[PDB]
Design a protein around this motif. Structure first.
Motif, short mmCIF file in Angstrom:
data_model
loop_
_atom_site.label_atom_id
_atom_site.label_comp_id
_atom_site.label_asym_id
_atom_site.label_seq_id
_atom_site.Cartn_x
_atom_site.Cartn_y
_atom_site.Cartn_z
N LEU A 187 -7.37 4.74 -5.90
CA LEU A 187 -6.57 3.99 -6.85
C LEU A 187 -7.18 3.84 -8.24
CD1 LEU A 187 -4.58 1.15 -5.17
CD2 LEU A 187 -4.23 3.62 -5.25
N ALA A 204 -2.67 -7.04 5.64
CA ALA A 204 -1.84 -7.42 6.78
C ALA A 204 -2.13 -6.55 8.00
CB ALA A 204 -0.36 -7.33 6.40
N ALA A 205 -2.12 -5.23 7.81
CA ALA A 205 -2.36 -4.33 8.94
C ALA A 205 -3.77 -4.49 9.49
CB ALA A 205 -2.11 -2.88 8.51
N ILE A 244 -1.63 -5.90 -0.23
CA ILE A 244 -0.98 -6.79 0.72
C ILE A 244 -0.77 -6.08 2.06
CG2 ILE A 244 1.32 -6.24 -0.18
CD1 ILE A 244 0.05 -9.47 1.48
N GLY A 245 -0.30 -4.83 2.03
CA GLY A 245 -0.10 -4.11 3.27
C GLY A 245 -1.39 -3.85 4.01
N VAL A 246 -2.45 -3.45 3.30
CA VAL A 246 -3.71 -3.13 3.96
C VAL A 246 -4.29 -4.37 4.61
CG1 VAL A 246 -6.11 -2.68 3.44
CG2 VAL A 246 -4.39 -1.01 2.82
N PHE A 289 -0.89 -3.79 -5.93
CA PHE A 289 -0.34 -4.99 -5.31
C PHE A 289 0.11 -4.72 -3.88
CE2 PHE A 289 1.00 -7.51 -9.35
CZ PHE A 289 -0.30 -7.45 -9.79
N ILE A 290 0.98 -3.73 -3.70
CA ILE A 290 1.52 -3.45 -2.38
C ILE A 290 0.44 -2.86 -1.48
CG2 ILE A 290 2.47 -1.30 -3.29
CD1 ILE A 290 4.64 -1.80 -0.92
N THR A 291 -0.42 -2.00 -2.02
CA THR A 291 -1.47 -1.43 -1.17
C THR A 291 -2.38 -2.54 -0.64
OG1 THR A 291 -2.24 0.86 -1.15
CG2 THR A 291 -3.69 -0.76 -2.17
N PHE A 307 -0.87 1.06 -10.58
CA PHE A 307 0.32 0.23 -10.43
C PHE A 307 0.78 0.07 -8.99
CE2 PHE A 307 1.61 4.56 -11.38
CZ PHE A 307 2.50 4.83 -10.37
N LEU A 308 0.07 0.65 -8.02
CA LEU A 308 0.37 0.47 -6.61
C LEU A 308 -0.56 -0.53 -5.94
CD1 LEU A 308 1.18 4.10 -5.44
CD2 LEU A 308 2.67 2.36 -6.40
#
Ligand SMILES: Cc1cc2nc3c(=O)[nH]c(=O)nc-3n(C[C@H](O)[C@H](O)[C@H](O)COP(=O)(O)OP(=O)(O)OC[C@H]3O[C@@H](n4cnc5c(N)ncnc54)[C@H](O)[C@@H]3O)c2cc1C
Ligand SMILES: Cc1cc2nc3c(=O)[nH]c(=O)nc-3n(C[C@H](O)[C@H](O)[C@H](O)COP(=O)(O)O)c2cc1C
Ligand SMILES: Cc1cc2nc3c(=O)[nH]c(=O)nc-3n(C[C@H](O)[C@H](O)[C@H](O)COP(=O)(O)O)c2cc1C
Ligand SMILES: Cc1cc2nc3c(=O)[nH]c(=O)nc-3n(C[C@H](O)[C@H](O)[C@H](O)CO)c2cc1C
Ligand code: FES
Ligand code: FES
Ligand SMILES: [Ca+2]
Lengths: 408, 251, 446, 204, 387, 198
Positions: free
Chosen positions: F64, F88-89, F84-86, F80-82, F77-78
């Motif tokens: 990133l 969580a998983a 939160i998802g990482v 935030f989602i990377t 710009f990815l």
């Protein structure tokens, strides 16, 4: 453009890599197996549930309609289920309604239980046990100004198995009822014309169920008789919708068909040798008339009886032709009545005022075995509130007083 | 079936979300960089004193007057490089592009220093009128940054604006007070012996002093931070050789 | 043997001269009703009925089988009832000497009597009501059996009668009582005494343990917390020594023994001394000609824990062995709270009284100051020798919490154990009622 | 009409009756306009997320519904951040991380899960607008006090003439710190509870 | 007045419940006795402030400028009208009167505002208006610098009484030291008025660092009093001739006042012992480690004891019975904690030159954790049945 | 190792998440009923932050960072989602692994994990780490310090609110208002270390 497609493909690859790991965790490590539960130890039938399914939902799907009216949140607490094997993790929501009296065996709440292993239940036979009888209406005569005595006959002449003090549940489908068709004799027309209840009308769009205590002692076979009061709106807010099921019962006429669902009961009479004192008011006549006939005609008990009734006037009084005969036949039973405010037409010569005042002055003030007697109470709440207050003031424990409030 | 349906819907949602978010992010990069450049340009123009208002006016005025360059600290001479898009912060953060200072010399308590430095010349015609040196140093609660606008002579200060600090407002954050910033005009940096002569005087300095300046009331720690900042960045370890070359000429 | 360090003695004037003298004649005896905690009576007599000694007066509704006996023969005269018709005191008028006889025994067989026979004899004679279990201080049910019978053979209450003098006149009876208790215990029998010597039982079940120190050393609560910690799953029974003497005399002679020795002492007693009377004696009759003029208050039991015996309650309690009379005070003193009083006692050293070691005070019933929120200046920690957290436990009890108190250790305590804690309270609280309410809630919820 | 818009303003305020969603409200209210921008962003994000989730609620993979809502909320939030950086750079500088904190924000996640997942898109959007209004109310009326008593300014407009500019008012410096916001919220909820007595909690 | 009867008289009640005999101690006695133990400290603080004012004035000015200064400000002309002198030979009476004209208005304002809030709250809640406020008001009056404007003191006491004591339910229910909450509100709200050099010496145009700030800058050799030029000796700093706040200047007066309450059993000696042992240990460790830039590392414990507000804090202010730990081991640990925190904030924090109040505010949070740990260990010992 | 210990102390006291940056208060106030419950959820938060931050630093340094994977293309710009998802998983996998392999350890942390799988505190810590540009070991230490500081804050507040069993809170403020007020005073107390150079 190069950045857009690169970001798109990297985004998709990232989310796919995350979701594959999550799916691997949720599919290769968890049991993924069905769970089997046993309702009772003796029967061989077992209910199949799921690891992620709730106990209440599983029972509802299997058809075991255990006591429940909300489905969760601790609003009612009716979902309590007996167990003989289960997990030791008692949720705080379960502990809110389960005290240390029930925590000894550790019974849980159905809406708060997830079946993660092969546990067992110890539910009462009634949890999965009930009946029903299409009862034909014989008569719906008026014995009081606001009380109709419905009479129902069970088909095939089969007397329902019940104990004095039980209550049936009656189902009412969606219907609209005007008050114009109610049969009320010329004796009771006085108040209805003054208050003008004929202009009301009911509106029910979904089936409903309510509880109503029997007015017949068990030896009267093949008859289901009740004392149903009208749930008219209070004289303070006439715009509120009126009583749904009470309008339906008053709307029931002679010869119609009605359905009842099983004998129930929790308001019983104790088996002792102590004095019984019955105190009644309003439409609480249906339960009491059952026990007095029960202990006198079925059990032939020799204990000391006394029944006290309050009334608004002499036109609200009934059943005493049985009661006067009962007092004439038996020496144990002695009954008295008192009117709140009498009318000059009645020529009343007897006890007046509130019943709690009457029973105190005549009997309890000079009684020498206070508290030693049992009391049965059922009627309007304020009558109930006054009588428990004075009985506590005369020093009686809560075990001896055994009341039955008609839904508050 | 169920698993294939879930995979298909997840992939479709990922694709649509990716395309929309990627278009949105790609579209506005130029505008974001323009906004950052506009902020820096407004600060530099306000330091120099050329009045400006509005993005277009700021852009045209900056491009006409100012002209960024690069300076090598060790020799105090100009070098070649992309002066417009230099990033001194990341250059100093890089281990390869920045030396490590020793506890004896690190007066300002910055413990690092970029190998290449940036200035901002002010030009009205072919000649040069002002030179602006960006400086920084540690205060009390956080990092502090400022520009000092040295006249073409090499000793006279023509302005100073603290555009990034985090001291307590009212007490320590008085550095941005105009009644205090205006105190630096006319003051001199080097004495007749070309030594660092700027000195923050606790309790106030006499009016019209040669190298004095009033300290911050009840904020001697921030005053010491400013004093250390200037005493370091005006020494030989900082812009010293470059200011000496300015005094010699060639600007 | 066990030394208690933290504790408080009460220097209140008028100590009883330890010489037994025959007390004044008594004509009314009675049974209190409130102190038998958890008992709701089922009456068995009416006004005007005639009863004999050891005859049944009433039974317990929630503790079936136990029978309370009439201390003296005579005619029932008064049956007082308070609010909610709760029993206050059944008044017996002394008349005649008719009683009911029971089975007799010899000394040797006492150590081998059957538990069932012992239980039946004690329950019928009515002396079974002497045992107080722990927790809940309730009279034990007719079928239960414990592992330790604690015989309180020492007394450290203020103005308390000296047990050695009373016991040394009934050595054979005490031996008989200890033998019967050793046969009944099913376990061990702990008798707690001072350094002095008492008559000895030969059975190997009887153990003798010696305590030394200030007042908290003479209570069943402390004895039990130091020798056999009581829990919800391990109950023990407590009995005062004169009831042991009564048990011995009962098993030896076949008749109930109703005599008592109480210490009539206090600030306003003309001549404190030991007197001899029968349980339930009317303090109104007993205190005649023994008191100085002035407003007074009759207290059954010690000044630390007692009952304000005026009216229906003016009768000696079942579990009490002393009468304390002290002067009432209703004087609002100007600058009284800030006066450096020479005569103002305090366990806290905030007054000049503590400088004069060995001083004796002329105490009253006034409560200095008024009710205020409790500020723990460090006073409770001087008067709790038990290994319990006083400051936390008292706040927990005041907060109304129940399970937290049970976890903290509120089970071992009792009404009389917190007497010192309410005695020393800066906020002038009363913790006996709080503890009683908490124990009632704990028992009722399950 | 639009009774659902005004329903969650006071009866079930997310920081008065409910407790969820205070991480932003605790530290973004140092100025009024930053809180205003945050409130607008929460409104837009919550409304659009509820709209899309309720659109896709029929064919949900119920095993990863949380991940799917997080994906849609991320797709909304990153776009919002990009727009804020492009057009409102000065304000986006102040917000910094807290604009990115919207992804995890409890109010938006709970409204996506509880109501959007089981409701029609138009009611989902209206409920999102309503709870955005309920949250923006407390944001505005905490930021007002904090800015007014910390700088004597509103939206950058000066109201009370500060001492340093020759006025008469001295800035109470505590209002720029978190405990001031804590106490403000506490006294506010006390006022709300004493003017709407039905929400008083029991002793236990 | 009718309400004065409740103060001048005892209630005259009789024991209604079982325990018929009670001790003579009571809350009014405790609070009044504490209120009567800081009197030596305050009677020295007034004189010290007066002496410092005289010294600073007659060092800064001379001649007709003295008349110009005394004519403008009000304290000096009030003293001259009452009969004092502003010259270099001012008697102890004149110094004390000049100190009083500084101390008394702050105390009066604090008392009036706090009493207003107390009466309003106790009237609305229908509780009995109790004691404790006498201690709180005098303490907050004694821990502030002499030249506080009165409105700042009013705001501080309003905060410390309403938001920290009354809102929790009154005396005995709070968990944060109320006077310290008010002082902290003032400290973090108007730092320009309760810290620096311009505030401590109540003079006009006099700027001079105090005893603690000098050491952090220049070691032991920098302990110099600019008013007269004489080095500050330990005997001076212990008898209370330093320029500082109005209450804690005299460690000897504080010790004399605290000895009676400690011997009286009102204040637990466990807390004081813990504070002393913690301060000594931390000072010794820092001294042993040493440093060549932060010169505060070599201030020994005996120099740490009398400087700053340590004496006042530890003696009268950390020993609050209602906020401290309740078990004995908890009290010991709490004293250790506040001592260690005070020394740590003094030594290794450059923004604040003293941290006793911050240490107390920090340890008031952690006292209940200490008592919970001790009580849980006790519960374990009880469940083991051997105790 | 002076650096690791210093970073631990900083992340514990100087940069306390719940009382210097003020995140995670929804769970902070609600869970605070019981001291034991607060301690358990604190241990859950810290064990989450031991691995949430290091793997995120790995991802940011690998795929990133600007021009990290291919020169000239920036993919910031990815994040935030990377993130939160990482997170969580990676906490879901740990929870399931502990449940399957060590039930005795799982009962102590799995009660709170499904509710704190995504939270304000973890995202704030990850974002601040990415802003500050730590390394792998410094990231590990920062997580293990910040989580324990958060646990200390919640445990202290729970103990205070347990001691509040004696207070007569006014009816209007009972509960939420008094919790917010006492959190305010707790922050006021914790403001002591703000100036420490470390
Ligand atoms: C075990 C048991 C035994 C019982 N036995 C008897 C018995 O023998 N006889 C008997 O008469 N009852 C008995 N009851 C009471 C039973 O609930 C009756 O059905 C009762 O009269 C309710 O009548 P309903 O269902 O027609 O009216 P409901 O619809 O249940 O309620 C109507 C009443 O509520 C008011 N109301 C309706 N809607 C509103 C509104 N929106 N806002 C405010 N007020 C409103 C109406 O004005 C009216 O007063 C028994 C209950 C129990 C549990
Ligand atoms: C809350 C607070 C914040 C402060 N902030 C600063 C600051 O940012 N810069 C500064 O130099 N002093 C600041 N101070 C004051 C210093 O910490 C110190 O007390 C004082 O400056 C030392 O005296 P002197 O500066 O006059 O020599 C602050 C004081 C307080 C109470
Ligand atoms: C109990 C108490 C606590 C104090 N706490 C602080 C503090 O935290 N910070 C501070 O600057 N001054 C504090 N002071 C005031 C200092 O003692 C002193 O007035 C000032 O800090 C300068 O110290 P000095 O006069 O000893 O050099 C406190 C005073 C007292 C009595
Ligand atoms: C020895 C002692 C010290 C006290 N110290 C303080 C103090 O430092 N601050 C304060 O506000 N109250 C103090 N008080 C008053 C009171 O105990 C305190 O305010 C309680 O916490 C009630 O608010 C003290 C009381 C005593 C007996
Ligand atoms: S069904 Fe009502 S709470 Fe469970
Ligand atoms: S606590 Fe901040 S969003 Fe939940
Ligand atoms: Ca930087």
């Amino acid at each position: 453009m190069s950045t857009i497609i690169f970001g798109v493909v990297m985004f998709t690859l990232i989310i796919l890599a995350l979701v594959l790991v999550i799916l691997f965790a949720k599919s290769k490590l968890v049991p993924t197996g069905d769970i089997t539960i046993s309702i009772n130890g003796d029967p061989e039938k077992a209910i199949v549930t799921q690891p992620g399914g709730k106990l209440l939902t599983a029972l509802a799907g299997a058809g075991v309609f255990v006591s429940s009216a909300c489905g969760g949140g601790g609003s009612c607490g009716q979902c309590r289920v007996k167990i003989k094997s289960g997990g030791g993790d008692i949720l705080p929501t379960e502990l809110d309604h389960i005290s240390k009296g029930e925590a000894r065996e550790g019974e849980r709440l159905a809406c708060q239980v997830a079946v993660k292993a092969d546990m067992d239940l110890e539910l009462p036979e009634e949890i999965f046990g009930v009946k029903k009888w299409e009862c034909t209406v014989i008569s719906n005569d008026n014995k009081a100004t606001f009380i109709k005595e419905l009479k129902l006959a069970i088909p095939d002449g089969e007397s329902v198995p019940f104990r004095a003090g039980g209550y049936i549940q009656i189902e009412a489908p969606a219907h609209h009822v005007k008050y114009a068709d109610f049969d009320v004799p010329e004796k009771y027309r006085g108040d209805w014309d003054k208050f003008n209840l004929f202009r009301y009308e009911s509106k029910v769009d979904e089936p409903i169920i309510r509880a109503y205590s029997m007015a017949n002692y068990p030896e009267e076979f093949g008859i289901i008789m009740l004392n149903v009061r009208i749930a008219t709106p209070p004289p303070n807010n006439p715009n509120v919708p009126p009583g749904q099921m009470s309008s339906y019962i008053w709307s029931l006429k002679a010869g119609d068909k009605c359905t009842i669902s099983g004998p129930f009961g929790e308001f019983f009479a104790k088996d002792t040798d102590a004095e019984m004192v019955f105190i009644g008011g309003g439409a609480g006549m249906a339960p009491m008339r059952s026990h007095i006939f029960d202990q006198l005609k079925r059990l032939k008990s020799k204990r000391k009886m006394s029944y006290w009734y309050g009334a608004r006037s002499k036109r609200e009084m009934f059943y005493v032709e049985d009661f006067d005969g009962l007092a004439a036949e038996n020496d144990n039973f002695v009954w008295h009545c008192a009117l709140s405010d009498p009318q000059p037409e009645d020529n009343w010569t007897g006890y007046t005022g509130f019943i709690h005042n009457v029973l105190y002055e005549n009997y309890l003030k000079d009684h020498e075995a206070p508290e030693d007697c049992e009391y049965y109470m059922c009627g309007p709440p304020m009558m109930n509130a006054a009588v428990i207050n004075m009985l506590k003031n005369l020093g009686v424990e809560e075990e001896n007083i055994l009341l039955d409030d008609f839904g508050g | 079936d169920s698993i294939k349906k879930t995979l298909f819907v997840v992939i479709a949602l990922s694709l649509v979300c990716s395309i929309i978010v990627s278009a949105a992010a790609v579209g506005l990069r130029d505008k974001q960089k323009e906004n950052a450049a506009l902020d820096k340009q407004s600060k530099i123009l306000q330091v120099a004193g050329i009045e400006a208002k509005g993005s277009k006016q700021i852009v045209e005025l900056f491009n006409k007057s100012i002209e960024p360059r690069l300076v090598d600290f060790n020799t105090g001479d100009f070098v070649e490089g992309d002066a417009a898009n230099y990033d001194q912060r990341k250059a100093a953060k890089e281990a390869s592009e920045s030396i490590k200072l020793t506890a004896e010399q690190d007066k300002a308590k910055i413990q690092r220093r970029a190998n290449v430095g940036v200035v901002y010349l002010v030009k009205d015609g072919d000649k040069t009128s002002k030179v602006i040196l960006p400086v920084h140093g540690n205060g009390l609660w956080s990092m502090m940054y400022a520009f000092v606008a040295v006249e073409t002579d090499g000793n006279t200060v023509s302005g100073l604006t603290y555009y990034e600090q985090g001291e307590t407002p009212g007490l320590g954050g008085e550095v941005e007070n105009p009644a205090w910033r205006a105190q630096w005009v006319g003051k001199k940096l080097f004495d007749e012996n070309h030594k660092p002569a700027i000195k923050i005087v606790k309790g106030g300095a006499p009016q019209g002093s040669e190298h004095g300046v009033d300290g911050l009331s009840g904020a001697t720690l921030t005053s010491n931070g400013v004093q250390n900042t200037f005493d370091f960045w005006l020494g030989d370890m900082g812009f010293g050789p470059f200011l000496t070359k300015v005094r010699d000429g060639g600007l | 043997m066990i030394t208690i360090k933290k504790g408080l003695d009460l220097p209140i004037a008028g100590t009883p001269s330890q010489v037994i003298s025959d007390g004044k004649a008594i004509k009314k005896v009675a049974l209190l009703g409130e102190e038998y905690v958890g008992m709701r009576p089922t009456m068995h007599v009416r006004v005007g009925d005639e009863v004999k000694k050891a005859q049944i007066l009433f039974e317990d509704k929630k503790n079936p089988g136990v029978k309370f006996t009439s201390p003296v023969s005579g005619k029932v005269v008064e049956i007082n009832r308070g609010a909610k018709r709760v029993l206050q005191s059944v008044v017996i008028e002394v008349a005649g000497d008719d009683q009911v006889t029971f089975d007799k025994f010899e000394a040797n067989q006492l150590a081998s009597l059957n538990r069932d026979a012992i239980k039946t004899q004690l329950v019928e004679s009515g002396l079974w009501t002497a045992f107080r279990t722990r927790p809940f201080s309730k009279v034990p049910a007719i079928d239960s059996t414990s592992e330790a019978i604690f015989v309180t053979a020492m007394d450290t209450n203020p103005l308390a009668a000296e047990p050695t003098v009373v016991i040394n006149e009934q050595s054979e009876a005490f031996v008989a009582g200890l033998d019967v208790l050793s046969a009944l215990t099913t376990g061990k029998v702990y008798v707690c005494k001072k350094g002095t010597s008492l008559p000895r039982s030969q059975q190997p079940n009887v153990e003798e343990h010696v305590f030394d120190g200030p007042h908290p050393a003479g209570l069943a609560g402390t004895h039990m917390h130091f020798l056999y910690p009581v829990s919800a799953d391990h109950v023990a029974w407590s009995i005062n020594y004169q009831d042991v003497i009564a048990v011995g005399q009962l098993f030896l002679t076949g008749e109930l023994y109703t005599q008592r020795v109480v210490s009539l002492a206090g600030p306003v007693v003309n001549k404190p001394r030991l007197v001899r009377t029968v349980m339930g004696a009317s303090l109104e009759q007993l205190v005649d000609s023994e008191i100085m003029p002035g407003e007074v208050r009759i207290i059954s039991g010690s000044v630390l824990s007692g009952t304000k015996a005026t009216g229906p309650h003016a009768y000696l309690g079942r579990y009490h062995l002393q009468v304390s009379v002290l002067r009432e005070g209703r004087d609002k003193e100007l600058f009284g709270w800030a006066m450096p009083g020479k005569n103002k006692f305090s366990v806290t050293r905030s007054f000049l009284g503590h400088l004069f070691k060995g001083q004796v005070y002329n105490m009253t019933t006034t409560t200095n100051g008024s009710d205020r929120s409790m500020v723990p200046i460090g006073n409770y920690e001087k008067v709790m020798p038990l290994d319990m957290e006083p400051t936390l436990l008292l706040r927990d009890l005041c907060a109304g919490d129940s399970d937290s108190a049970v976890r903290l250790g509120a089970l071992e305590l009792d009404e009389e154990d917190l007497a010192l804690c309410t005695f020393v309270c800066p906020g002038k609280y009363e913790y006996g009622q709080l503890l009683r309410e908490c124990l009632d809630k704990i028992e009722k919820e399950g | 009409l639009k009774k659902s818009v005004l329903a969650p303003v006071l009866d079930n305020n997310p920081i008065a009756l409910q407790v969820l969603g205070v991480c932003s409200a605790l530290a973004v209210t140092t100025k009024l306009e930053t809180a205003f921008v945050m409130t607008l962003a929460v409104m837009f994000v919550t409304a659009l997320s509820n709209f899309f989730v309720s659109l896709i609620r029929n064919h949900i993979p119920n095993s990863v519904r949380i991940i799917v809502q997080m994906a849609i909320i991320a797709s909304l939030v990153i776009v919002v951040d990009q727009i804020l950086k492009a057009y409102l750079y000065d304000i986006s500088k102040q917000l910094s991380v807290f604009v990115g904190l919207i992804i995890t924000n409890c109010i938006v996640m709970g409204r996506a899960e509880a109501f959007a997942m089981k409701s029609e898109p138009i009611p989902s959007f209206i409920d999102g607008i309503g709870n955005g209004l309920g949250y923006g109310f407390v944001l505005m009326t905490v930021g007002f006090f904090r800015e007014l008593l910390g700088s004597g300014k509103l939206f950058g407009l000066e109201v009370l003439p500060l001492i340093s500019n020759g006025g008469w008012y001295q800035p109470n410096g505590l209002m720029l710190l978190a405990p001031s916001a804590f106490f403000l919220i506490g006294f506010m909820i006390w006022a709300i509870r004493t003017f709407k007595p039905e929400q008083v909690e029991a002793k236990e | 007045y009718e309400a004065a009867a409740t103060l001048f008289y005892t209630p005259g009640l009789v024991t209604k419940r079982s325990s018929h005999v009670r001790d003579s101690v009571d809350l009014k006695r405790i609070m009044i006795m504490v209120w009567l133990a800081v009197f030596p400290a305050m009677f020295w603080g007034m004189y010290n402030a007066g002496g410092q004012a005289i010294a600073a004035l007659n060092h800064l000015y001379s001649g007709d400028q003295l008349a110009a200064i005394v004519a403008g400000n009000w304290h000096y002309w009030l003293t001259e009208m009452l009969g004092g002198t502003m010259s270099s030979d001012a008697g102890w009476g004149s110094k004390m009167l000049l100190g009083a004209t500084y101390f008394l208005p702050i105390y009066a304002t604090v008392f009036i505002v706090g009493g207003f809030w107390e009466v309003l709250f106790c009237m609305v809640r229908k509780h009995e208006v109790n004691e404790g406020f006498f201690v709180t008001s005098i303490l907050f009056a004694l821990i502030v610098p002499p030249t506080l404007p009165l409105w700042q003191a009013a705001l501080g006491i309003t905060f410390g009484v309403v938001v920290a004591k009354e809102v929790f339910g009154g005396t005995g229910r709070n968990f944060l030291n109320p006077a310290l909450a008010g002082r902290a509100f003032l400290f973090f709200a108007y730092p320009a008025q309760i810290s620096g050099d311009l505030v401590w010496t109540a003079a006009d145009g006099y700027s001079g660092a105090t005893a603690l700030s000098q050491w952090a800058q220049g070691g032991a050799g920098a302990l110099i009093n600019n008013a007269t030029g004489q080095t500050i000796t330990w005997m001076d700093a212990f008898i209370g001739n330093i320029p500082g706040s109005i209450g804690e200047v005299s460690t000897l007066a504080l010790m004399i006042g605290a000895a009676f309450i400690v011997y009286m059993g009102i204040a637990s000696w466990r807390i004081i012992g813990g504070v002393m042992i913690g301060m000594i240990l931390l000072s010794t460790l820092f001294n042993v480690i040493g440093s060549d830039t932060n010169a505060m590392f070599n201030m020994p414990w005996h120099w740490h004891l009398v400087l700053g507000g340590f004496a006042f804090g530890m003696f009268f202010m950390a020993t609050d019975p209602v906020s401290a730990s309740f078990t004995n081991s908890g009290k010991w640990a709490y004293g250790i904690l506040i001592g260690v925190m005070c020394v740590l904030i003094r030594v290794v924090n450059p923004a604040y030159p003293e941290g006793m109040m911050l240490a107390i505010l920090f340890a008031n949070l952690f006292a209940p954790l200490f008592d919970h740990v001790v009580v849980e260990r006790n519960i374990k010992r009880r469940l083991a049945r051997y105790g | 190792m002076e650096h690791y210990i210093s970073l631990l102390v900083k992340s514990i006291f100087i940069e306390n998440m719940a009382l210097s940056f003020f995140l995670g208060m929804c769970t902070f106030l609600a869970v605070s009923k019981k001291v034991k419950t607060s301690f358990g959820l604190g241990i859950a938060v810290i064990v989450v932050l031991t691995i949430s931050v290091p793997v995120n630093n790995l991802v940011y340094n690998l795929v990133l960072k600007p021009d990290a994977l291919v020169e000239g293309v920036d993919l910031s710009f990815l994040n935030f989602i990377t993130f939160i998802g990482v997170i969580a998983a990676l906490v879901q996998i740990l929870e399931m692994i502990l449940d399957r392999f060590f039930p005795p350890l799982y009962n102590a942390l799995g009660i709170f994990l499904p509710l704190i799988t995504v939270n304000c505190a973890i995202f704030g810590g990850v974002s601040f780490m990415v802003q500050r540009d730590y390394s792998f070991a410094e990231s590990v230490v920062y997580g293990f310090g910040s989580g324990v500081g958060w646990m200390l804050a919640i445990v202290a507040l729970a103990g205070i609110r347990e001691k509040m069993k004696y207070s007569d809170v006014p009816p209007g403020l009972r509960g939420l208002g008094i919790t917010f007020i006492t959190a305010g005073l707790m922050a006021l107390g914790f403001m002591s270390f703000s100036g420490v150079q470390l």
